[PDB]
Design a protein around this motif. Structure first.
Motif, PDB file in Angstrom:
ATOM      1  N   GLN A 261       0.853  -1.067   0.136  1.00 31.49           N
ATOM      2  CA  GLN A 261      -0.074  -0.016   0.080  1.00 31.49           C
ATOM      3  C   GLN A 261       1.031   1.179   0.137  1.00 31.49           C
ATOM      4  O   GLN A 261       0.464   2.344  -0.762  1.00 31.49           O
ATOM      5  CB  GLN A 261      -1.129  -0.097   1.134  1.00 31.49           C
ATOM      6  CG  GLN A 261      -2.134   0.883   0.860  1.00 31.49           C
ATOM      7  CD  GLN A 261      -3.317   0.071  -0.077  1.00 31.49           C
ATOM      8  OE1 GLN A 261      -2.997  -0.810  -0.984  1.00 31.49           O
ATOM      9  NE2 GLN A 261      -4.744   0.593   0.194  1.00 31.49           N
TER      10      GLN A 261
ATOM     11  N   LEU B 140     -14.201  -2.690 -16.791  1.00 34.13           N
ATOM     12  CA  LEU B 140     -13.887  -3.971 -16.362  1.00 34.13           C
ATOM     13  C   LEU B 140     -13.610  -4.270 -14.818  1.00 34.13           C
ATOM     14  O   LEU B 140     -14.054  -5.159 -14.321  1.00 34.13           O
ATOM     15  CB  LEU B 140     -12.620  -4.603 -17.130  1.00 34.13           C
ATOM     16  CG  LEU B 140     -13.131  -5.308 -18.367  1.00 34.13           C
ATOM     17  CD1 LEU B 140     -14.080  -6.624 -18.129  1.00 34.13           C
ATOM     18  CD2 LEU B 140     -14.108  -4.466 -19.360  1.00 34.13           C
ATOM     19  N   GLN B 141     -13.040  -2.895 -14.076  1.00 38.65           N
ATOM     20  CA  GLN B 141     -12.741  -3.295 -12.768  1.00 38.65           C
ATOM     21  C   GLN B 141     -14.300  -2.748 -11.921  1.00 38.65           C
ATOM     22  O   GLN B 141     -14.682  -3.101 -10.786  1.00 38.65           O
ATOM     23  CB  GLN B 141     -11.906  -2.258 -12.238  1.00 38.65           C
ATOM     24  CG  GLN B 141     -10.528  -3.071 -12.044  1.00 38.65           C
ATOM     25  CD  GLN B 141      -9.141  -2.156 -11.622  1.00 38.65           C
ATOM     26  OE1 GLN B 141      -9.165  -0.971 -11.659  1.00 38.65           O
ATOM     27  NE2 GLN B 141      -8.294  -2.711 -11.095  1.00 38.65           N
ATOM     28  N   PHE B 144      -7.820  -3.926   0.653  1.00 34.45           N
ATOM     29  CA  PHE B 144      -8.592  -3.296  -0.516  1.00 34.45           C
ATOM     30  C   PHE B 144      -7.922  -1.971  -0.701  1.00 34.45           C
ATOM     31  O   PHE B 144      -7.179  -1.453  -0.035  1.00 34.45           O
ATOM     32  CB  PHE B 144      -9.930  -3.043  -0.034  1.00 34.45           C
ATOM     33  N   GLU B 145      -8.282  -1.235  -1.734  1.00 37.37           N
ATOM     34  CA  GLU B 145      -7.732   0.209  -2.072  1.00 37.37           C
ATOM     35  C   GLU B 145      -8.416   1.243  -1.407  1.00 37.37           C
ATOM     36  O   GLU B 145      -8.009   2.454  -1.528  1.00 37.37           O
ATOM     37  CB  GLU B 145      -7.705   0.297  -3.663  1.00 37.37           C
ATOM     38  N   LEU B 147      -8.523   3.212   1.572  1.00 32.92           N
ATOM     39  CA  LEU B 147      -7.777   3.527   2.853  1.00 32.92           C
ATOM     40  C   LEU B 147      -8.542   4.784   3.345  1.00 32.92           C
ATOM     41  O   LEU B 147      -8.275   5.916   2.975  1.00 32.92           O
ATOM     42  CB  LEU B 147      -6.406   3.879   2.246  1.00 32.92           C
ATOM     43  CG  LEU B 147      -5.612   2.747   2.048  1.00 32.92           C
ATOM     44  CD1 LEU B 147      -5.739   2.163   0.504  1.00 32.92           C
ATOM     45  CD2 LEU B 147      -3.951   3.052   2.137  1.00 32.92           C
ATOM     46  N   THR B 184     -19.765   8.309  12.139  1.00 33.89           N
ATOM     47  CA  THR B 184     -20.057   6.811  11.324  1.00 33.89           C
ATOM     48  C   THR B 184     -18.563   6.007  11.411  1.00 33.89           C
ATOM     49  O   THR B 184     -18.569   4.851  11.702  1.00 33.89           O
ATOM     50  CB  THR B 184     -20.958   6.722  10.300  1.00 33.89           C
ATOM     51  OG1 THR B 184     -22.154   7.193  10.829  1.00 33.89           O
ATOM     52  CG2 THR B 184     -20.978   5.335   9.929  1.00 33.89           C
ATOM     53  N   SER B 188     -17.085   3.061  13.576  1.00 35.74           N
ATOM     54  CA  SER B 188     -16.770   1.796  12.838  1.00 35.74           C
ATOM     55  C   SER B 188     -15.420   1.173  13.393  1.00 35.74           C
ATOM     56  O   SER B 188     -15.266   0.069  13.289  1.00 35.74           O
ATOM     57  CB  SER B 188     -17.099   1.961  11.621  1.00 35.74           C
ATOM     58  OG  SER B 188     -16.077   2.675  11.024  1.00 35.74           O
TER      59      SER B 188
ATOM     60  N   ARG C 115     -21.493  -4.855   7.697  1.00 36.65           N
ATOM     61  CA  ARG C 115     -21.294  -3.575   8.308  1.00 36.65           C
ATOM     62  C   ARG C 115     -22.925  -3.218   8.372  1.00 36.65           C
ATOM     63  O   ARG C 115     -23.255  -2.745   9.428  1.00 36.65           O
ATOM     64  CB  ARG C 115     -20.469  -2.688   7.630  1.00 36.65           C
ATOM     65  CG  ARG C 115     -20.926  -1.244   7.861  1.00 36.65           C
ATOM     66  CD  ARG C 115     -19.632  -0.315   8.161  1.00 36.65           C
ATOM     67  NE  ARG C 115     -19.831   0.954   8.749  1.00 36.65           N
ATOM     68  CZ  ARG C 115     -19.904   1.221   9.975  1.00 36.65           C
ATOM     69  NH1 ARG C 115     -19.794  -0.121  10.874  1.00 36.65           N
ATOM     70  NH2 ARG C 115     -20.199   2.070  10.498  1.00 36.65           N
ATOM     71  N   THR C 287      -9.753  -8.605 -13.035  1.00 38.14           N
ATOM     72  CA  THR C 287     -11.466  -8.696 -13.454  1.00 38.14           C
ATOM     73  C   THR C 287     -11.594 -10.338 -13.766  1.00 38.14           C
ATOM     74  O   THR C 287     -12.498 -11.011 -13.271  1.00 38.14           O
ATOM     75  CB  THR C 287     -11.891  -8.100 -14.432  1.00 38.14           C
ATOM     76  OG1 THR C 287     -11.678  -6.636 -14.101  1.00 38.14           O
ATOM     77  CG2 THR C 287     -13.535  -8.172 -14.531  1.00 38.14           C
TER      78      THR C 287
END
Lengths: 548, 216, 436
Positions: A261, B140-141, B144-145, B147, B184, B188, C115, C287
Motif C-alpha cells: 500500500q 472491467l474493474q 482493498f484500495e 484507505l 459513523t 466503526s 457492516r 477482473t
C-alpha cells in the motif's frame, strides 16, 4: 569458404518453402561443426543486408541457433577471435538499427537467443554502448540500442542488468577520477546518458530484476534526477516510477499489504505534478510521452524531497526484508561520492547521504564542515554555492543523528549563522533549515531547560571569540554586546526571502527562539524583557498572537 | 454548463431528455473556422450529455434498437475522428473530445457498446486507442484500495490532522453530512472518543465565555 | 406517474393472509426486483404505501429468496436507505420475518454487507424456514401465499442424498431434480440455516460426467462450473440432461477481445498507448482472475519500452497454458487485428499467437459443432492471413504452420477447399505443416 558456401546454400534453399528443414539443418550443423559459426554469422549478415524482406525473415530463422557457439571464440582473449565475434555483434546491431520493419523479429529471435548467453554479454554491451557512443543521446543508434537492451536482459536478466547498472555506477565514479565543474559538460556525459536510456527500458523488465539492484538504481537517480536535456529528465522520472511499480510486483519478493500500500501510494505521489517539478519536468502533461535547455538550475531542496520519498519506499521494504543490506550499501555509495572531491556530483551526494543515513560520526561531520570551508575558499577564487547549500542541508539531516552529549549540536547553530551571513538566497534557505532543525534538536536534547540559548551558543563562541570578533566587526552585528538582537538581525533578512515557505520557516524559528528564551526563566512566552523583546519586535508583522 | 449543474436541476424524464439532446446536437457534428468551433462545442456538450447516460430509443427489440442507436452515434464519432486524421490545436481538441464522447457513451451503455468498442481498439489512431483502453479499464474493474485510515490517522498528542484540516475548510453547507461521515467512520473503528475529544476541545478552546459554549 | 403503477403489476411486494398470531402478512419476492430496472425509491414508496394502512399495528413479512442473485441485489446506498426511510415504530412492529429459500449468493451478500446488517445478526425476529413444511408452524397451510412459481419447485422431485459439493472445503449437499430446475440444498451454514441454490434448466449451459463418481454443471453467467461427487452421478447427470433437453425442445425456434487489444497495443511505437495497454492487461488479469507469473501492477504513468516483445510473448503463453477457454475468442480477434496492423504489429501478433495455437485441439476434442466450426473458421482466417501477408509469409510458415502441424483433417480440408496464389500458398505451407 566453408561459412560462405553454407550461408549461400541455406539462403538459396529458401529462395519455395522448406524453412523448418533449413532451420533443422542449421541447428544440426551449429551443434556439430562450431568453427563454421564465425564465418557463417559474418556471411549471414552480409547476405541478409543485400536480400529482400522475405529472405531476411528466412535468414534470421536459420541464423538463430549459431549464436550459442559465439562464446567459444571469446574464452581465449587473443584479439583476432574476440574481435571477429565483436564485429559480428556490431554487424547484428547495425542490422537491427537498419531493418525497422524486421524489428520485433530481430529482437525476439536474434537478441532473445543472445540474451541467453552470459559470457558474451560484456562484449555485447560494449558493442551496444560504443554503437550508442557514435552520437550519444539523440542519436537513433543509441535510441534503438536502449530499446534493444531489454532483449539482451530478457534471457539472463540479473547478469545483464548487473553489468549495465555496474557500468553506470563505475562511469559515475569515473567522473570523479577526472572532475569537471558541471555534469552535463563532463568528458563521460554521453556514456552516462546512454546508460540512463538503457536503464529506463530495462526498468520495466527490472520488475524481474530489482532485488539485488535497488540501491544502485537510486544512486543513479540521485545524480541524474533533474539534470541534462528534458528527455533524460523524463526518462529519469520514468526510471523511478517503473522501479516503484517493480517493487510492488517482483515475484521473488513478499512485501506486506502495508508495504505494498505504501508503494501504491508512492506511485500515486510520484505521478503528481509536485514530483514532476522535483525531477526538473515542467510544461508537460505526461512524462512518458517526452521520455520516449530550460534547466531549472537545480534546487537541492527538490533532491532532498525525492530522497526522503525514496527513503520511505526503501525503509518500508527493509522492514519486510530483514536479510537485505540495501540502505547500508546506499549509505556507502552516497558517502563515497559526498566526501570525494567532484564539483558536479558531490553536492547531490551530500544531500542524499544526509537524508538516508541512520548514524554519523564526528569524523564525518569534520569532513562535511571542511568541505563547507573549502567551498567558501573556492568562492574567494555557482558550483561552490551549490556545494555550500548541500553541506548545510547535509548538516540539517545529520544533526538529529549526532550523539546527545556532542558539542557539535551547539557548533552547528553557529555554522547556520555564518551561512546566513553569506547573503545568498538558497544558502539562507539552507541555513534557516539547518537552524530550524538545530533548535528542534537542542530542545529535544533538553538543553534549553536550565540555560538561555544566549549562554549555550556564546560558550562555544568563547574559544572562537578571537575569530568571532573579526566576523562580527565586518558583519556589523555583535552577539557579545547583545545576543538576541544579533541572532534576530540574521533572521530578519529571512523576511525578505523571495519564497513564502522560507519566510514561514523564519517565523517558526523566531517563535521557537522566543519560547526558548522565556523557557529558561519559566516566564510566559510573550513576557517582554531584555531578551524576549528582540524576537517580539521581529515577530511583529507576522504573529497575531504577538500583536494581540 | 447545464449538464454540470444536472446534479442541482430536476428532471421528470432525464434519460430521454439527454438522449434526445445527443440526437439533436449530433446532427450539427458535420465560415469553416466557425463550423469547426461549432463541432468542438457540440462535441464538448455531447461529452457532457453522455456521462452515465443509458441510451433510450422511442423489451428484446428495445435492447437491439439501443444497440443500433449506439452504432449510429459511435459511427458518427469515428467519422469525425477520421476527418481529424491554431488550426492544428483545434483539430486535436476536437479529436480528444470525440474520444471522450466514445468513452462516456461506452461507460454507460456496456451491453450495447462492447462489441463495437473492440472496433475502436483496432482503429489506426494510437491516441484514441489508448484512451479507449482506459475506458475499458473503468468498465472491467466496475463489473482493498479504499484507505480511510488517512482520515482516522492520529498524530503525536492525538492530532487527527486530516479531519481537523477538513473541518476548517469544508463549506458550511456540507457540515451537516460531514458530521455524519466522521461519526459513523470513527465509531466503526472504535475511535469515537478520539474524534469527540478533539472536536470538543477546539470548541471550548475558542469559546469566549462559558455562556457561548456550544450555543449556536 | 404511469411508471409507478407498473411496480404494482410486478408484485414484488403483496399482502396475503394472516399469521397464527393474528397479524397481517406481507410477501417480498426478491427475484422480481431487478436492480437498475426499477427506481429503488419507487419500489420503497410502493412498499410504504402498502404498509401504511397497517404498520401502526403488528405485522409479519415473508421474504421469498427463491433464486435470488446479483441481478436482484440492493446496492450499498439502496440497502442502507431501507433502514432509515420508515418510521421507527414500523420497524418495531415487525414481529416475524420468515426467510424462505435463502441461498449461497444471499449468504455471500450477507457477509459482504456485514457492516450494514449488524443489527440483523442473531436477531430473534428472523426465522429462516428449514423447508416448505415448517412455514405452517407460523402460518396455517390455507393461509400460505408464496408465489405459484415458488411452489412449483416443490413437486415431483428426484432426490439424490449425501452428494458432495467440491470446493476449497467440500460440503455435504442434497441434489434434487425437478421438471424445470435443479435444487442443491446444503446442511447448516451460517444463525445456522439450510441453503437452497436453484438452477433452472434454462441456465444449465453444460453438464459433464467426469468420473463414475463426479460431474460438473456449467451455469449461465457464473464462470466457474459447480463440481459434485456422488456414487450415482451417472443417473444424476442423465436426469439433468433430460430436464435441459425438455427445456430446449420447448423453446420457440470480452476477455479474448480485450486481451488481444491489450497485448497488440503493448507493441506500439506510442508510449502512452503502451502504458494504457499495460493498465488494461492488469485490469483484465484482476477482473478475470487470469493466473500470471511475474506479477502485474496497475498504475498511471508507467513508461514501458517499445521493444517489449519478449514480455508480451511471455504473458501470452503463460496465459495460453493458464486460460485455454480464451483461445478461440482470442485467436480469431488477433487474426482480425493482423489485417488491421502495420508489419511490425503483424510480426508481434505471430509471436504472441504462437502459444495459443496448441490449445485449438481442446476445442475439436469438444463435441460442440459450433466450437468445431469456430476452430475451422480460425484455420480459414489463418489461411487468409497466410495468403495475404506475403512479407511475413516465410516467417508465418515457420511459427504458425509448424506449431499447427503438432485437427489435421480439418486443416487439409480447409487448405483444399480454399484452394478450390491461394492454391500455391497451400501447397508450399503444407511443407511446414508436415514437419509436425
Amino acid at each position: 569458404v566453408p561459412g560462405t558456401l553454407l550461408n549461400i546454400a541455406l539462403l538459396n534453399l529458401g529462395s519455395a518453402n522448406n524453412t523448418l528443414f533449413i532451420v533443422s539443418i542449421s541447428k544440426t550443423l551449429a551443434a556439430n561443426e562450431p568453427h563454421l559459426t564465425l564465418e557463417f554469422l559474418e556471411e549471414c549478415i552480409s547476405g541478409f543486408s543485400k536480400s529482400s524482406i522475405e529472405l531476411k525473415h528466412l535468414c534470421l530463422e536459420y541464423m538463430t541457433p549459431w549464436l550459442s557457439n559465439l562464446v567459444r571464440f571469446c574464452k581465449h582473449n587473443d584479439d583476432a577471435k574476440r574481435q571477429r565475434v565483436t564485429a559480428i555483434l556490431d554487424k547484428l546491431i547495425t542490422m537491427t538499427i537498419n531493418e525497422k520493419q524486421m524489428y520485433p523479429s530481430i529482437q525476439a529471435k536474434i537478441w532473445g537467443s543472445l540474451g541467453q548467453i552470459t559470457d558474451l554479454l560484456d562484449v555485447v554491451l560494449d558493442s551496444f554502448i560504443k554503437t550508442s557512443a557514435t552520437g550519444g543521446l539523440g542519436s537513433i543508434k543509441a535510441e534503438v540500442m536502449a530499446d534493444t537492451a531489454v532483449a539482451l536482459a530478457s534471457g539472463n536478466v540479473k547478469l545483464v542488468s548487473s553489468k549495465v547498472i555496474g557500468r553506470m555506477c563505475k562511469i559515475i565514479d569515473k567522473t570523479c577520477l577526472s572532475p569537471t565543474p558541471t555534469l552535463e559538460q563532463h568528458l563521460m556525459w554521453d556514456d552516462i546518458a546512454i546508460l540512463a536510456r538503457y536503464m529506463l527500458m530495462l526498468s520495466f523488465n527490472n520488475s524481474l530484476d530489482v532485488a539485488a539492484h535497488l540501491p544502485y538504481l537510486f544512486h543513479v537517480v540521485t545524480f541524474l534526477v533533474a539534470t541534462g536535456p528534458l528527455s533524460l529528465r523524463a526518462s529519469t522520472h520514468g526510471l523511478v516510477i517503473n522501479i516503484i511499480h517493480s517493487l510492488c510486483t517482483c515475484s521473488q519478493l513478499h512485501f506486506s499489504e502495508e508495504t505494498k500500500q505504501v508503494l501504491r501510494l508512492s506511485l500515486t505521489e510520484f505521478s503528481l505534478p509536485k514530483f514532476y517539478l522535483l525531477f526538473g519536468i515542467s510544461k508537460v502533461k505526461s512524462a512518458a510521452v517526452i521520455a520516449f535547455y530550460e534547466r531549472e538550475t537545480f534546487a537541492l531542496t527538490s533532491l532532498e524531497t525525492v530522497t526522503e520519498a525514496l527513503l520511505e519506499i526503501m525503509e518500508a521494504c527493509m522492514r519486510d526484508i530483514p536479510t537485505c543490506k540495501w540502505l547500508d550499501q546506499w549509505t556507502e555509495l552516497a558517502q563515497r561520492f559526498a566526501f570525494q572531491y567532484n564539483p558536479s556530483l558531490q553536492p547531490r551526494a551530500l544531500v542524499v547521504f544526509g537524508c538516508i543515513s541512520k548514524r554519523v560520526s564526528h569524523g564525518q561531520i569534520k569532513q562535511i564542515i571542511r568541505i563547507l570551508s573549502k567551498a567558501l575558499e573556492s568562492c574567494l577564487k555557482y558550483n561552490s554555492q551549490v556545494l555550500i547549500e548541500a553541506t548545510v542541508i547535509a548538516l540539517t539531516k545529520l544533526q538529529p543523528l549526532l550523539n546527545k552529549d556532542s558539542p557539535l549540536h551547539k557548533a552547528l547553530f553557529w555554522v547556520a549563522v555564518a551561512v546566513l551571513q553569506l547573503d545568498e538566497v538558497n544558502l539562507y534557505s539552507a541555513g534557516t533549515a539547518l537552524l530550524e532543525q538545530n533548535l528542534h534538536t537542542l530542545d529535544s536534547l533538553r538543553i534549553f531547560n536550565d540555560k538561555s540559548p544566549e549562554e549555550v551558543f556564546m560558550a562555544i563562541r568563547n574559544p572562537l571569540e578571537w575569530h568571532c570578533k573579526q566576523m562580527d566587526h565586518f558583519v556589523g552585528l555583535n552577539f557579545n554586546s547583545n545576543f538576541n538582537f544579533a541572532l534576530v538581525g540574521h533572521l530578519l533578512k529571512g523576511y525578505r526571502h523571495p519564497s513564502p515557505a522560507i519566510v514561514a520557516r523564519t517565523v517558526r524559528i523566531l517563535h521557537t527562539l522566543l519560547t526558548l528564551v522565556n523557557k529558561h526563566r519559566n516566564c510566559d512566552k510573550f513576557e517582554v524583557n531584555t531578551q524576549s523583546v528582540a524576537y517580539l519586535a521581529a515577530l511583529l508583522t507576522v504573529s497575531e498572537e504577538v500583536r494581540s | 454548463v447545464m449538464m454540470a449543474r444536472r446534479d442541482d436541476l430536476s428532471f421528470c424524464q432525464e434519460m430521454k431528455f439527454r438522449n434526445k439532446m445527443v440526437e439533436y446536437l449530433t446532427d450539427w457534428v458535420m465560415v469553416k473556422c466557425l463550423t469547426r468551433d461549432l463541432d468542438q462545442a457540440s462535441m464538448e456538450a455531447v461529452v457532457s450529455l453522455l456521462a452515465g447516460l443509458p441510451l433510450q430509443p422511442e423489451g428484446v427489440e428495445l435492447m437491439e434498437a439501443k444497440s443500433q442507436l449506439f452504432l449510429k452515434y459511435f459511427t458518427l464519432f469515428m467519422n469525425l475522428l477520421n476527418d481529424c486524421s491554431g488550426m492544428s490545436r483545434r483539430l486535436a481538441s476536437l479529436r480528444h473530445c470525440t474520444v471522450l464522447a466514445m468513452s462516456n457513451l461506452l461507460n454507460a451503455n456496456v451491453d450495447s457498446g462492447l462489441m463495437h468498442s473492440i472496433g475502436l481498439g483496432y482503429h489506426k489512431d494510437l491516441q484514441t486507442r489508448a484512451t479507449f483502453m482506459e475506458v475499458l479499464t473503468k468498465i472491467l474493474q466496475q463489473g482493498f484500495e479504499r484507505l480511510v485510515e488517512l482520515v482516522t490517522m492520529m498524530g503525536d498528542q492525538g492530532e487527527l490532522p486530516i479531519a481537523m484540516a477538513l473541518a476548517n475548510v469544508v463549506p458550511c453547507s456540507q457540515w451537516d453530512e460531514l458530521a455524519r461521515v466522521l461519526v459513523t467512520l470513527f465509531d466503526s473503528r472504535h475511535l469515537l472518543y478520539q474524534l469527540l475529544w478533539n472536536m470538543f476541545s477546539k470548541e471550548v478552546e475558542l469559546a469566549d465565555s462559558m455562556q457561548t459554549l456550544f450555543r449556536g | 406517474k404511469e411508471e409507478f403503477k407498473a411496480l404494482k403489476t410486478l408484485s414484488i411486494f403483496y399482502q396475503a393472509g394472516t399469521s397464527k398470531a393474528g397479524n397481517p402478512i406481507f410477501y417480498y419476492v426478491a427475484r422480481r426486483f431487478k436492480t437498475g430496472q426499477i427506481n429503488g425509491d419507487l419500489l420503497i414508496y410502493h412498499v410504504l404505501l402498502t404498509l401504511k394502512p397497517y404498520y401502526a399495528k403488528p405485522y409479519e413479512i415473508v421474504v421469498d429468496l427463491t433464486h435470488t442473485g446479483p441481478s436482484n441485489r440492493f446496492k450499498t446506498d439502496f440497502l442502507s436507505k431501507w433502514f432509515v426511510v420508515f418510521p421507527g415504530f414500523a420497524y418495531d412492529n415487525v414481529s416475524a420475518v420468515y426467510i424462505y429459500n435463502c441461498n449461497s449468493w444471499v449468504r455471500e451478500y450477507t457477509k459482504y454487507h456485514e457492516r450494514l446488517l449488524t443489527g440483523l445478526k442473531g436477531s430473534k425476529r428472523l426465522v429462516f424456514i428449514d423447508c416448505p413444511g415448517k412455514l405452517a408452524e407460523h402460518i396455517e397451510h390455507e393461509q400460505q401465499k408464496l408465489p405459484a412459481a415458488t411452489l412449483a419447485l416443490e413437486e415431483d422431485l428426484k432426490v439424490f442424498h449425501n452428494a458432495l459439493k467440491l470446493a476449497h472445503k467440500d460440503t455435504k449437499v442434497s441434489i434434487k431434480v425437478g421438471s424445470t430446475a435443479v435444487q442443491v440444498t446444503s446442511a447448516e451454514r451460517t444463525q445456522s440455516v439450510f441453503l437452497n441454490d436453484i438452477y433452472y434448466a434454462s441456465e444449465i449451459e453444460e453438464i459433464c460426467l467426469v468420473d463414475e463418481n463426479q460431474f460438473t454443471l456449467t451455469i449461465a453467467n457464473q464462470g466457474t462450473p459447480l463440481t459434485f461427487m456422488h456414487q450415482e452421478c451417472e443417473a444424476i447427470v442423465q436426469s439433468i440432461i433430460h430436464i435441459r433437453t425438455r427445456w430446449e425442445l420447448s423453446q420457440p425456434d470480452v476477455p479474448g477481445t480485450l486481451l488481444n487489444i491489450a497485448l497488440l497495443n503493448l507493441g506500439s511505437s506510442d508510449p502512452s498507448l503502451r502504458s494504457a495497454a499495460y493498465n488494461l492487461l492488469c485490469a483484465l488479469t484482476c477482473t478475470f482472475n487470469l493466473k500470471i507469473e511475474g506479477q502485474l501492477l496497475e498504475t498511471s504513468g508507467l513508461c514501458i519500452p517499445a521493444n517489449n516483445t519478449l514480455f508480451i510473448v511471455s504473458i501470452s503463453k503463460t496465459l495460453a497454458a493458464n486460460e485455454p477457454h480464451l483461445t478461440l475468442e482470442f485467436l480469431e480477434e488477433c487474426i482480425s487485428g493482423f489485417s488491421k496492423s502495420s508489419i511490425e504489429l503483424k510480426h508481434l501478433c505471430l509471436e504472441y499467437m504462437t502459444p495459443w495455437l496448441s490449445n485449438l485441439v481442446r476445442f475439436c476434442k469438444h463435441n460442440d459443432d459450433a466450437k468445431r466450426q469456430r476452430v475451422t473458421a480460425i484455420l480459414d482466417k489463418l489461411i487468409t492471413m497466410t495468403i495475404n501477408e506475403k512479407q511475413m509469409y516465410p516467417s508465418i510458415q515457420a511459427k504458425i504452420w509448424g506449431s499447427l502441424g503438432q485437427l489435421l483433417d480439418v486443416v487439409l480440408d480447409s487448405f483444399i477447399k480454399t484452394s478450390a496464389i491461394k492454391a500455391e500458398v497451400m501447397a508450399d505451407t503444407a511443407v511446414a505443416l508436415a514437419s509436425g
